[PDB]
């Protein structure tokens, strides 16, 4: 189940699924937690490695066996995802990092009085994922008190530099501290355009909204329903953003459903798991394991315990059943979502609850 233990002076080797820059090991672990395939991570603080462009390196990893070889390396930090850790799963990261410049796409500069006022500007700008603030002591005078609001692919810095008198941090939007509004609207028969940042398959628009909420680049979405006119585009969840952070257009379109990320929401933030069981539906994906169980609910329990299981299909086809048990197909994909969603089947599909952090 839940493994919070960290491993000092350790670097996991191989199994790499994604890498990025993060300011510390706790942030790297959080990105591991929310990456659909990450089980293990290794982090390199600036002190731990000579190579410049490997400092602050955060390496997300997977293993069919849940274990990997590791080497001793002084100062490196390794650990697990917080999958299956309930309330410890959080997107909230409050830390101000002093003497650090988290680099990205600068879309906003102003002069501010303190780092916490810079943090506030970032938190209340919908496009800001992280910021950098140069203090009154900063060596170059023109930049003193500059507050830079930034974003980047995946919401992690494209570089992190050790730099005196610069203070960086992330938006507190995922800490429910934004004054940006929470928009629960679901628009029937309505599509957005702008810029597509990801594409997955979802059984309904509500799953699509939840994925958008926790995807670092998604501000709004358009879901194409199972009765959408183009067969190959059925159940397509289009995650989107725009230059301003707001949709620049909207198009009435039958069998399309659109809405917003809910990450600004407080009382009504959806948790990062999808609990609904979907009768009559097959979820395509890589087979992880086939077990015989009594009823869809135990099949979901079985997926949830199998930490690498992302979603499941419990079949009632006669060829998949025997004396008082039917087969539970445990599955996974590259992105956490089904590779195909097929209707009119004798099977009930659902998701792992490994990331539920409520209830």
């Amino acid at each position: 189940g839940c493994l919070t233990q960290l491993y000092e002076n350790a670097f996991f080797r191989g199994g790499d699924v994604a890498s990025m820059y993060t300011p510390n090991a706790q942030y790297c672990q959080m990105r591991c937690t929310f990456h659909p395939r990450c089980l293990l991570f290794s982090f390199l603080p600036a002190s731990s490695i000579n190579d410049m462009e490997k400092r602050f390196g955060c390496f997300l990893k997977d293993s069919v066996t849940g274990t990997l070889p590791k080497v001793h390396r002084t100062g490196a930090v390794s650990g697990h995802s917080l999958k299956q850790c309930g309330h410890q799963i959080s997107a909230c990261h409050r830390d101000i990092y002093k003497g650090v410049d988290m680099r990205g796409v600068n879309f906003n500069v102003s002069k501010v009085s303190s780092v916490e006022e810079c943090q506030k500007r970032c938190t209340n700008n919908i496009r800001c994922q992280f910021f950098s603030y140069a203090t009154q002591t900063f060596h170059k005078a023109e930049y003193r008190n500059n507050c830079l609001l930034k974003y980047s692919p995946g919401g992690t810095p494209t570089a992190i530099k050790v730099l005196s008198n610069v203070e960086s941090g992330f938006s507190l939007k995922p800490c429910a501290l934004s004054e940006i509004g929470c928009h629960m609207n679901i628009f029937q028969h309505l599509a957005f355009s702008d810029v597509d940042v990801a594409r997955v398959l979802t059984p309904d628009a509500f799953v699509c909204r939840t994925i958008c909420t926790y995807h670092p680049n998604c501000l709004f979405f358009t879901f194409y329903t199972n009765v959408w006119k183009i067969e190959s585009q059925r159940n397509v969840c289009l995650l989107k953003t725009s230059e301003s952070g707001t949709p620049s257009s909207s198009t009435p379109q039958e069998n399309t459903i659109s809405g917003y990320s809910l990450l600004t929401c407080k009382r009504t933030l959806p948790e990062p798991c999808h609990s609904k069981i979907y009768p009559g539906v097959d979820f395509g994906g890589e087979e992880l394991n086939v077990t015989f169980v009594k009823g869809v609910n135990v099949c979901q329990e079985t997926c949830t315990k199998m930490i690498r299981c992302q979603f499941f299909t419990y079949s009632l086809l006669p060829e998949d059943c025997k004396a008082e048990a039917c087969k539970c197909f445990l599955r996974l994909s590259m992105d956490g979502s089904p590779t195909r969603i097929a209707y009119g089947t004798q099977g009930s599909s659902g998701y792992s609850l490994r990331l539920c952090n409520t209830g």
């Binding site: 680099r103 600068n106 950098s132 170059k140 500059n146 830079l148 730099l163 610069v166």
Partner: peptide, 7 residues
């Protein structure tokens, strides 16, 4: 456009 902090 908006340059980074120097050095």
């Amino acid at each position: 456009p908006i340059s980074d902090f120097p050095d």
